[PDB]
């Protein structure tokens, strides 16, 4: 019971318990939402991970690059939530960019095939998911994707930043479509969260200079953030996602909410 | 009970029952907040107006241009809410620009004395209010001001748009100060709301061409808005203000939330 | 002689005499630049078109999706301009999005393969071109790409707008690379220009509703533009491109100059 | 002779030889412009300073807060340039904020009277100057003001940043007016320039912490700037101002050109 009581919400993007989407799922359940989860490749893993969620939630396979998965998606969700029931919320918390598109690999050296896959999973799939799910969403519904502010270039994030810029653009178009359904579409631009991958890149997985730069990035983020930024705490971002899934931001779409400690509003 | 249960929130800016702040007050009370109101010049009027709020709320005079009012403000609020109690939220819903700074009066013809008064009440007072009230705000608190997106120029709004640009700048600095207190500071950029004044300007009070332009503005807003925009309904904006007053946007400050139907994210 | 006197500048993107790049080429030559042109598929056509340029300019084939073309590009340019000579400027005036990614074809119905090709040619190729050409660019050099402001969604332009958002992101990264060479990288966001394709879409080639919307778009652009916008005149944009190719914007990179009549700075 | 040959251009804001406007004046003269200068309080000083300009230029007193100065301004300029001659360019390079509005003085402690004076001189005067001078400007003319990117808050700059936000807003409205005259209005957002005042604040004139912060600000600016930023060199900014005064940015108004080394396009 609470912020999302009675809402049926699909949450994609759980892969581990430090997945941003894990915390989104957890908070949404604490707030009364009934979840359907989608998981990409390692469903056994994901099932075991989501066992620790406050409540049980059906898990559906969704490889966002798999047209059949997307084509079957709404029927599978309807099976999961019961005929005559629709989704009130959809959470896109998916992103990927091949290593060549990031870190120390020179920006110019990322082969387009890699970039394109990154943009497919990280940006285009936002529209894919909305296409699959809008038919089974209620008026007053909410689609939320995860963004990392790409409005300025930065070290290491390279083509993933490009992918986020594309995602932000996609979101504005998804909002136009979603609006026909009485549905809002918005992004949450989060501060840096020490996910496994972020920890790995800080630890030098994508090159020492990239690691050093990302560390400087996270330090400066907390410094700039008027209320600070705790990269080890995804809860403030999960809460923000939940804010958008709720009825409490009913006049916002095609938009980006910055759950980044206010870092983006401050130069130094 | 609900979104704001237990929160003590000061709401400025009620002058009539069509004041944006009236609806902010109403929704906040429906959501469990305990209010203190401030009212500017016509306290008898404002008291009679706020009698229709779901709950009684002490009303304090606050002329934001009156240094003594601001100097006494926190003690008066403490009297009203009880010693040992602090505010959790502050709503700045105040704005004013002399007629010369708006409408058909040529932009170049607004005397600086008029502009300055407009900027005093509409922008600087955001910092004034934060200065007066941050000492009596709890950690986790929230200050929210009302904004109208000034990022592009527009007909008729003239120097009030300039004042909003200044307000947005002020908010970013107020966030820096507020952050020391564990307090967030944010603006809600609302779509156009058919307040008495907006109705009056549509009806030609500031010149026929200004009226015509503002009418075109509100029509285009609803057209652009992916979810539409109902200028006769301040509830979606009151709800958004409440979202920011709540614990559900805990990593956003110095920021602007657009409760405008998504109009600003769409060109045409 | 003039603004670009002595500069050696590669201009991509001429396909017809109404190509934005044709006018960029023409103005650059009027201003003293020595050009190398690249042309994509119809070289005989392009040669015949560029015969009308004020001066002769070597034409090199460049299919931006062809890795060999890009791999050979700098040597071919060096052959064309003479060993020991480098480029001072590069103009990316290339864009393409399959029909499915635009117009009346539902946004959700653009297959990723189409989108990806669009993003390849329209966004990624900006980095491709910079990768190929930075080794043969002089310090103080300038790379300029053509942008159409994607900061808000719009009818009909659909995935091309997404591609522009990606391009703007790419440009910011290209600037980081280009900076190592003493080279600036910038976009020109032009107003709508009645190119063959734009005329075709206005005339209904991508659906009547798309045509109607684009017509409304161009009308509103001129209305919003404080100095007007003449979609039949690419000269103000060619001049702006030339401004960026010149030494007169020497502290601007990763940036976007808006040659749009000021339309983007105005709401209504 | 050159970029501005034959143009008659009013350049305000020279106070010393390290004034940004001194370099704007110098470059404009090197480029063929005929100047009229305006100077604020110390005309003897300013005359002696501008004696070192490449060419002689009439100097007119203009206190932008003095309505009579502004009321007489266009006739005095016409006297200076000759009846039947008009201005082609106007440079607003004026700014001021009382000490209370900056540095270590708490943001909340700047009395509105101080802020208002700051906003008067730094923002409103942009409109004042355009009002005074548009009647005596040629079609194809250009008004340029000096901006410091206020889109994010920063240490020390406090209410001057607010003033710049207001200036940027004013510029968008001035463009609407200027457009009626065939005149463009634009800002140049410069990187930090080690003007006397900036040197003084770095040296602790407005508090040690403000000095330290501004020093960090200038260091980070050069680091972020893809082409670097040399705060001791106003020439790249003078050149940019000249770019806008020229015919080479003929489709840009109400706009801001960033002569900041690209720093604003980069996060880290
Ligand atoms: N960690 C951070 O600092 C920030 C992350 N974000 C965004 O949050 C979102 C979630 O990522 P995180 O939780 O950080 O990492 P994560 O690695 O835990 O989540 C990424 C998810 O994307 C899924 N995915 C990858 N390819 C897929 C495909 N083909 N089909 C379906 N799912 C696929 C993965 O299985 C995984 O669940 C991403 O969009 C990310 O860019 C935004 C701001 C900051
Ligand atoms: N009506 C609209 O379309 C939009 C309004 N807003 C903003 O919402 C806020 C509230 O305005 P509305 O509700 O529309 O109009 P309103 O006229 O009902 O509220 C303005 C309030 O400001 C108060 N005020 C004026 N001078 C004051 C002073 N010296 N000291 C203390 N209070 C003073 C008035 O008493 C009144 O309560 C304003 O900031 C306005 O700019 C934002 C977007 C759109
Ligand atoms: N026409 C307009 O209203 C606006 C156009 N722009 C941009 O200006 C640029 C030039 O386009 P326009 O002159 O309008 O149209 P255009 O059709 O004359 O130019 C597009 C060019 O891209 C080239 N191209 C396509 N695929 C290519 C590939 N594989 N390799 C190399 N070149 C390829 C074409 O051959 C053609 O020369 C584009 O980036 C466009 O998006 C920007 C704002 C407005
Ligand atoms: N120095 C810097 O790092 C940056 C400065 N700018 C802007 O460049 C512009 C010029 O300032 P700077 O050259 O840096 O300093 P400056 O101190 O040399 O120029 C300021 C000018 O404003 C004039 N002024 C002050 N009050 C006036 C009034 N009542 N009437 C007429 N003129 C008045 C002063 O006499 C002086 O000539 C200002 O708008 C400033 O904010 C923009 C970005 C950075």
Short mmCIF file of N, CA, C and O in Angstrom, two decimals, chain B residues 46-147:
data_model
loop_
_atom_site.label_atom_id
_atom_site.label_comp_id
_atom_site.label_asym_id
_atom_site.label_seq_id
_atom_site.Cartn_x
_atom_site.Cartn_y
_atom_site.Cartn_z
N UNK B 46 -8.40 37.31 2.00
CA UNK B 46 -7.68 36.02 1.93
C UNK B 46 -8.21 35.08 2.97
O UNK B 46 -8.41 33.92 2.68
N UNK B 47 -8.49 35.59 4.17
CA UNK B 47 -9.06 34.73 5.22
C UNK B 47 -10.39 34.12 4.76
O UNK B 47 -10.62 32.92 4.86
N UNK B 48 -11.24 34.96 4.19
CA UNK B 48 -12.55 34.52 3.73
C UNK B 48 -12.40 33.47 2.62
O UNK B 48 -13.11 32.46 2.63
N UNK B 49 -11.47 33.71 1.70
CA UNK B 49 -11.13 32.72 0.64
C UNK B 49 -10.65 31.42 1.21
O UNK B 49 -11.14 30.35 0.81
N UNK B 50 -9.69 31.48 2.13
CA UNK B 50 -9.11 30.23 2.61
C UNK B 50 -10.01 29.48 3.59
O UNK B 50 -9.79 28.28 3.85
N UNK B 51 -11.06 30.15 4.08
CA UNK B 51 -12.13 29.42 4.80
C UNK B 51 -12.65 28.22 4.02
O UNK B 51 -13.09 27.23 4.62
N UNK B 52 -12.60 28.28 2.69
CA UNK B 52 -13.08 27.13 1.89
C UNK B 52 -12.06 26.02 1.70
O UNK B 52 -12.39 24.97 1.12
N UNK B 53 -10.84 26.22 2.17
CA UNK B 53 -9.87 25.13 2.21
C UNK B 53 -10.41 23.94 3.04
O UNK B 53 -11.19 24.14 3.96
N UNK B 54 -10.05 22.71 2.71
CA UNK B 54 -10.55 21.54 3.46
C UNK B 54 -10.31 21.64 4.97
O UNK B 54 -11.08 21.08 5.75
N UNK B 55 -9.25 22.37 5.36
CA UNK B 55 -8.90 22.53 6.75
C UNK B 55 -8.54 23.95 7.05
O UNK B 55 -8.13 24.70 6.16
N UNK B 56 -8.68 24.32 8.32
CA UNK B 56 -8.28 25.64 8.83
C UNK B 56 -6.77 25.74 8.79
O UNK B 56 -6.06 24.74 8.97
N UNK B 57 -6.28 26.93 8.53
CA UNK B 57 -4.85 27.14 8.50
C UNK B 57 -4.60 28.56 8.92
O UNK B 57 -5.26 29.48 8.43
N UNK B 58 -3.65 28.76 9.83
CA UNK B 58 -3.31 30.10 10.22
C UNK B 58 -2.84 30.90 9.02
O UNK B 58 -2.16 30.36 8.14
N UNK B 59 -3.20 32.18 9.00
CA UNK B 59 -2.85 33.05 7.91
C UNK B 59 -1.97 34.15 8.46
O UNK B 59 -2.35 34.80 9.41
N UNK B 60 -0.80 34.36 7.84
CA UNK B 60 0.12 35.38 8.28
C UNK B 60 0.34 36.38 7.17
O UNK B 60 0.44 36.02 6.00
N UNK B 61 0.42 37.65 7.53
CA UNK B 61 0.64 38.64 6.53
C UNK B 61 2.10 38.55 6.07
O UNK B 61 3.02 38.46 6.89
N UNK B 62 2.29 38.59 4.76
CA UNK B 62 3.63 38.65 4.20
C UNK B 62 3.60 39.44 2.94
O UNK B 62 3.11 39.00 1.90
N UNK B 63 4.10 40.65 3.08
CA UNK B 63 4.43 41.46 1.96
C UNK B 63 5.92 41.23 1.77
O UNK B 63 6.76 41.63 2.57
N UNK B 64 6.21 40.59 0.67
CA UNK B 64 7.55 40.13 0.36
C UNK B 64 8.51 41.32 0.10
O UNK B 64 9.73 41.20 0.18
N UNK B 65 7.95 42.50 -0.14
CA UNK B 65 8.78 43.70 -0.26
C UNK B 65 9.01 44.43 1.09
O UNK B 65 9.69 45.46 1.18
N UNK B 66 8.41 43.87 2.14
CA UNK B 66 8.45 44.50 3.44
C UNK B 66 9.48 43.74 4.30
O UNK B 66 9.27 42.60 4.67
N UNK B 67 10.62 44.38 4.56
CA UNK B 67 11.73 43.74 5.25
C UNK B 67 11.32 43.30 6.65
O UNK B 67 11.79 42.27 7.14
N UNK B 68 10.46 44.08 7.30
CA UNK B 68 10.01 43.76 8.66
C UNK B 68 9.15 42.50 8.64
O UNK B 68 9.24 41.67 9.54
N UNK B 69 8.31 42.37 7.61
CA UNK B 69 7.46 41.19 7.49
C UNK B 69 8.32 39.97 7.41
O UNK B 69 8.01 38.95 7.99
N UNK B 70 9.39 40.07 6.62
CA UNK B 70 10.30 38.95 6.39
C UNK B 70 11.14 38.65 7.64
O UNK B 70 11.41 37.50 7.97
N UNK B 71 11.54 39.72 8.32
CA UNK B 71 12.34 39.65 9.56
C UNK B 71 11.54 39.01 10.68
O UNK B 71 12.07 38.24 11.51
N UNK B 72 10.24 39.31 10.72
CA UNK B 72 9.39 38.70 11.73
C UNK B 72 8.85 37.35 11.29
O UNK B 72 8.30 36.61 12.12
N UNK B 73 9.01 37.01 10.01
CA UNK B 73 8.25 35.88 9.46
C UNK B 73 8.44 34.56 10.19
O UNK B 73 7.46 33.90 10.56
N UNK B 74 9.69 34.15 10.38
CA UNK B 74 9.93 32.85 11.02
C UNK B 74 9.36 32.75 12.46
O UNK B 74 8.87 31.70 12.88
N UNK B 75 9.45 33.83 13.24
CA UNK B 75 8.86 33.79 14.62
C UNK B 75 7.34 33.66 14.57
O UNK B 75 6.74 32.86 15.28
N UNK B 76 6.71 34.43 13.68
CA UNK B 76 5.27 34.32 13.47
C UNK B 76 4.90 32.92 13.02
O UNK B 76 3.91 32.37 13.50
N UNK B 77 5.71 32.30 12.15
CA UNK B 77 5.38 30.93 11.72
C UNK B 77 5.54 29.96 12.90
O UNK B 77 4.76 29.04 13.06
N UNK B 78 6.60 30.16 13.68
CA UNK B 78 6.83 29.33 14.87
C UNK B 78 5.67 29.49 15.88
O UNK B 78 5.18 28.49 16.40
N UNK B 79 5.21 30.72 16.11
CA UNK B 79 4.01 30.93 16.92
C UNK B 79 2.87 30.09 16.38
O UNK B 79 2.19 29.40 17.14
N UNK B 80 2.67 30.13 15.07
CA UNK B 80 1.54 29.47 14.42
C UNK B 80 1.58 27.94 14.48
O UNK B 80 0.53 27.31 14.61
N UNK B 81 2.78 27.36 14.39
CA UNK B 81 2.93 25.90 14.36
C UNK B 81 3.39 25.31 15.68
O UNK B 81 3.39 24.10 15.86
N UNK B 82 3.80 26.18 16.60
CA UNK B 82 4.19 25.74 17.93
C UNK B 82 5.68 25.64 18.06
O UNK B 82 6.35 25.11 17.17
N UNK B 83 6.21 26.15 19.17
CA UNK B 83 7.63 26.12 19.47
C UNK B 83 8.12 24.69 19.36
O UNK B 83 7.37 23.75 19.65
N UNK B 84 9.35 24.51 18.89
CA UNK B 84 9.90 23.16 18.73
C UNK B 84 9.43 22.46 17.46
O UNK B 84 9.83 21.33 17.18
N UNK B 85 8.54 23.11 16.71
CA UNK B 85 8.11 22.56 15.43
C UNK B 85 8.73 23.35 14.30
O UNK B 85 8.85 24.57 14.40
N UNK B 86 9.10 22.66 13.23
CA UNK B 86 9.64 23.36 12.08
C UNK B 86 8.78 23.07 10.86
O UNK B 86 8.00 22.08 10.83
N UNK B 87 8.91 23.93 9.86
CA UNK B 87 8.38 23.66 8.49
C UNK B 87 9.12 22.56 7.74
O UNK B 87 10.34 22.43 7.81
N UNK B 88 8.35 21.78 7.00
CA UNK B 88 8.87 20.81 6.07
C UNK B 88 8.79 21.31 4.64
O UNK B 88 9.48 20.80 3.77
N UNK B 89 7.94 22.30 4.40
CA UNK B 89 7.76 22.76 3.03
C UNK B 89 7.43 24.21 3.00
O UNK B 89 6.84 24.76 3.94
N UNK B 90 7.85 24.83 1.90
CA UNK B 90 7.54 26.22 1.65
C UNK B 90 7.14 26.35 0.18
O UNK B 90 7.81 25.81 -0.72
N UNK B 91 6.02 27.03 -0.04
CA UNK B 91 5.53 27.28 -1.36
C UNK B 91 5.52 28.79 -1.61
O UNK B 91 4.79 29.56 -0.96
N UNK B 92 6.33 29.18 -2.58
CA UNK B 92 6.36 30.51 -3.10
C UNK B 92 5.45 30.46 -4.34
O UNK B 92 5.76 29.79 -5.32
N UNK B 93 4.30 31.10 -4.24
CA UNK B 93 3.41 31.20 -5.39
C UNK B 93 3.05 32.68 -5.54
O UNK B 93 1.88 33.09 -5.52
N UNK B 94 4.09 33.47 -5.68
CA UNK B 94 3.93 34.88 -5.82
C UNK B 94 4.61 35.49 -7.04
O UNK B 94 5.72 35.12 -7.45
N UNK B 95 3.90 36.43 -7.64
CA UNK B 95 4.38 37.04 -8.84
C UNK B 95 3.61 38.30 -9.05
O UNK B 95 2.45 38.42 -8.65
N UNK B 96 4.26 39.25 -9.66
CA UNK B 96 3.64 40.50 -10.00
C UNK B 96 4.57 41.20 -10.95
O UNK B 96 5.78 41.16 -10.74
N UNK B 97 4.00 41.87 -11.94
CA UNK B 97 4.73 42.77 -12.79
C UNK B 97 3.77 43.89 -13.10
O UNK B 97 2.64 43.62 -13.53
N UNK B 98 4.19 45.14 -12.89
CA UNK B 98 3.34 46.27 -13.27
C UNK B 98 2.92 46.16 -14.73
O UNK B 98 3.62 45.55 -15.56
N UNK B 99 1.77 46.75 -15.06
CA UNK B 99 1.20 46.68 -16.38
C UNK B 99 2.15 47.16 -17.45
O UNK B 99 2.14 46.62 -18.56
N UNK B 100 2.95 48.17 -17.12
CA UNK B 100 3.91 48.71 -18.08
C UNK B 100 4.91 47.62 -18.51
O UNK B 100 5.45 47.68 -19.58
N UNK B 101 5.13 46.61 -17.66
CA UNK B 101 6.07 45.54 -17.98
C UNK B 101 5.44 44.42 -18.76
O UNK B 101 6.07 43.40 -19.02
N UNK B 102 4.19 44.59 -19.15
CA UNK B 102 3.50 43.52 -19.87
C UNK B 102 2.61 43.95 -21.01
O UNK B 102 2.41 45.13 -21.28
N UNK B 103 2.08 42.95 -21.69
CA UNK B 103 1.02 43.17 -22.64
C UNK B 103 1.47 44.06 -23.77
O UNK B 103 2.62 44.00 -24.22
N UNK B 104 0.55 44.90 -24.21
CA UNK B 104 0.73 45.80 -25.34
C UNK B 104 1.69 46.96 -25.06
O UNK B 104 2.27 47.50 -26.02
N UNK B 105 1.88 47.36 -23.79
CA UNK B 105 2.91 48.39 -23.48
C UNK B 105 4.22 47.89 -24.08
O UNK B 105 4.64 46.79 -23.76
N UNK B 106 4.81 48.66 -25.01
CA UNK B 106 6.08 48.28 -25.64
C UNK B 106 7.09 47.84 -24.60
O UNK B 106 7.22 48.46 -23.53
N UNK B 107 7.75 46.73 -24.90
CA UNK B 107 8.79 46.16 -24.03
C UNK B 107 9.78 47.24 -23.58
O UNK B 107 10.13 47.31 -22.40
N UNK B 108 10.21 48.07 -24.52
CA UNK B 108 11.20 49.15 -24.25
C UNK B 108 10.65 50.25 -23.38
O UNK B 108 11.42 51.03 -22.81
N UNK B 109 9.33 50.34 -23.26
CA UNK B 109 8.73 51.41 -22.48
C UNK B 109 8.49 51.11 -21.01
O UNK B 109 7.99 51.96 -20.30
N UNK B 110 8.81 49.91 -20.54
CA UNK B 110 8.63 49.59 -19.13
C UNK B 110 9.74 50.30 -18.36
O UNK B 110 10.91 50.02 -18.57
N UNK B 111 9.38 51.23 -17.46
CA UNK B 111 10.41 51.99 -16.75
C UNK B 111 11.09 51.01 -15.80
O UNK B 111 10.41 50.13 -15.26
N UNK B 112 12.39 51.15 -15.60
CA UNK B 112 13.09 50.22 -14.73
C UNK B 112 12.48 50.09 -13.32
O UNK B 112 12.45 49.01 -12.77
N UNK B 113 11.94 51.19 -12.78
CA UNK B 113 11.33 51.15 -11.46
C UNK B 113 10.22 50.13 -11.46
O UNK B 113 10.05 49.40 -10.48
N UNK B 114 9.46 50.05 -12.55
CA UNK B 114 8.39 49.04 -12.63
C UNK B 114 8.94 47.62 -12.73
O UNK B 114 8.52 46.72 -12.01
N UNK B 115 9.87 47.44 -13.66
CA UNK B 115 10.54 46.15 -13.85
C UNK B 115 11.13 45.62 -12.54
O UNK B 115 10.92 44.47 -12.15
N UNK B 116 11.83 46.52 -11.85
CA UNK B 116 12.51 46.20 -10.61
C UNK B 116 11.54 45.74 -9.53
O UNK B 116 11.81 44.78 -8.78
N UNK B 117 10.41 46.42 -9.43
CA UNK B 117 9.39 45.99 -8.50
C UNK B 117 8.92 44.58 -8.92
O UNK B 117 8.76 43.70 -8.10
N UNK B 118 8.68 44.39 -10.21
CA UNK B 118 8.27 43.08 -10.71
C UNK B 118 9.29 42.02 -10.35
O UNK B 118 8.94 40.94 -9.87
N UNK B 119 10.57 42.34 -10.54
CA UNK B 119 11.60 41.35 -10.28
C UNK B 119 11.76 41.12 -8.79
O UNK B 119 11.99 39.98 -8.34
N UNK B 120 11.57 42.18 -8.01
CA UNK B 120 11.56 42.07 -6.55
C UNK B 120 10.54 41.03 -6.07
O UNK B 120 10.86 40.05 -5.38
N UNK B 121 9.29 41.21 -6.48
CA UNK B 121 8.22 40.35 -6.02
C UNK B 121 8.27 38.95 -6.62
O UNK B 121 8.03 37.97 -5.92
N UNK B 122 8.62 38.87 -7.90
CA UNK B 122 8.53 37.64 -8.66
C UNK B 122 9.80 36.75 -8.59
O UNK B 122 9.69 35.55 -8.77
N UNK B 123 10.98 37.34 -8.32
CA UNK B 123 12.23 36.60 -8.40
C UNK B 123 13.00 36.72 -7.11
O UNK B 123 13.29 35.73 -6.44
N UNK B 124 13.36 37.95 -6.76
CA UNK B 124 14.17 38.14 -5.57
C UNK B 124 13.51 37.56 -4.31
O UNK B 124 14.19 36.94 -3.50
N UNK B 125 12.18 37.74 -4.18
CA UNK B 125 11.41 37.25 -3.02
C UNK B 125 11.52 35.75 -2.83
O UNK B 125 11.31 35.23 -1.74
N UNK B 126 11.84 35.02 -3.90
CA UNK B 126 12.12 33.59 -3.71
C UNK B 126 13.29 33.37 -2.77
O UNK B 126 13.22 32.51 -1.88
N UNK B 127 14.37 34.14 -2.97
CA UNK B 127 15.52 34.11 -2.06
C UNK B 127 15.12 34.69 -0.68
O UNK B 127 15.55 34.16 0.33
N UNK B 128 14.31 35.75 -0.66
CA UNK B 128 13.85 36.38 0.62
C UNK B 128 13.14 35.38 1.45
O UNK B 128 13.37 35.26 2.66
N UNK B 129 12.21 34.69 0.80
CA UNK B 129 11.44 33.71 1.52
C UNK B 129 12.32 32.59 2.04
O UNK B 129 12.18 32.16 3.19
N UNK B 130 13.22 32.09 1.19
CA UNK B 130 14.14 31.04 1.64
C UNK B 130 15.02 31.54 2.80
O UNK B 130 15.27 30.80 3.74
N UNK B 131 15.48 32.79 2.75
CA UNK B 131 16.30 33.34 3.82
C UNK B 131 15.50 33.33 5.13
O UNK B 131 16.00 32.86 6.14
N UNK B 132 14.25 33.79 5.07
CA UNK B 132 13.38 33.90 6.26
C UNK B 132 13.08 32.54 6.82
O UNK B 132 12.99 32.38 8.03
N UNK B 133 12.93 31.53 5.95
CA UNK B 133 12.32 30.28 6.38
C UNK B 133 13.25 29.10 6.57
O UNK B 133 12.93 28.18 7.33
N UNK B 134 14.38 29.09 5.87
CA UNK B 134 15.34 28.00 6.04
C UNK B 134 15.75 27.77 7.52
O UNK B 134 15.83 26.64 7.93
N UNK B 135 15.95 28.82 8.32
CA UNK B 135 16.23 28.61 9.75
C UNK B 135 15.18 27.80 10.49
O UNK B 135 15.51 27.09 11.43
N UNK B 136 13.93 27.84 10.02
CA UNK B 136 12.86 27.07 10.66
C UNK B 136 12.34 25.93 9.79
O UNK B 136 11.17 25.56 9.92
N UNK B 137 13.20 25.38 8.93
CA UNK B 137 12.87 24.21 8.13
C UNK B 137 13.62 22.98 8.55
O UNK B 137 14.82 23.04 8.84
N UNK B 138 12.91 21.86 8.53
CA UNK B 138 13.48 20.56 8.82
C UNK B 138 14.35 20.05 7.69
O UNK B 138 14.05 20.34 6.52
N UNK B 139 15.38 19.26 8.02
CA UNK B 139 16.09 18.45 7.00
C UNK B 139 15.10 17.63 6.23
O UNK B 139 14.07 17.22 6.78
N UNK B 140 15.37 17.40 4.94
CA UNK B 140 14.38 16.71 4.12
C UNK B 140 13.26 17.63 3.64
O UNK B 140 12.31 17.17 2.98
N UNK B 141 13.35 18.90 4.00
CA UNK B 141 12.36 19.89 3.60
C UNK B 141 12.43 20.27 2.12
O UNK B 141 13.34 19.86 1.40
N UNK B 142 11.47 21.07 1.68
CA UNK B 142 11.29 21.35 0.26
C UNK B 142 10.76 22.75 0.09
O UNK B 142 9.76 23.10 0.70
N UNK B 143 11.46 23.57 -0.69
CA UNK B 143 10.91 24.86 -1.09
C UNK B 143 10.57 24.77 -2.58
O UNK B 143 11.37 24.23 -3.38
N UNK B 144 9.38 25.26 -2.94
CA UNK B 144 8.86 25.18 -4.29
C UNK B 144 8.35 26.56 -4.65
O UNK B 144 7.58 27.15 -3.90
N UNK B 145 8.79 27.07 -5.81
CA UNK B 145 8.26 28.29 -6.38
C UNK B 145 7.59 28.04 -7.71
O UNK B 145 7.82 27.02 -8.35
N UNK B 146 6.74 28.98 -8.12
CA UNK B 146 5.99 28.85 -9.35
C UNK B 146 6.70 29.60 -10.46
O UNK B 146 7.08 30.76 -10.29
N UNK B 147 6.86 28.91 -11.58
CA UNK B 147 7.64 29.37 -12.71
C UNK B 147 6.73 29.31 -13.93
O UNK B 147 5.77 28.53 -13.96
#
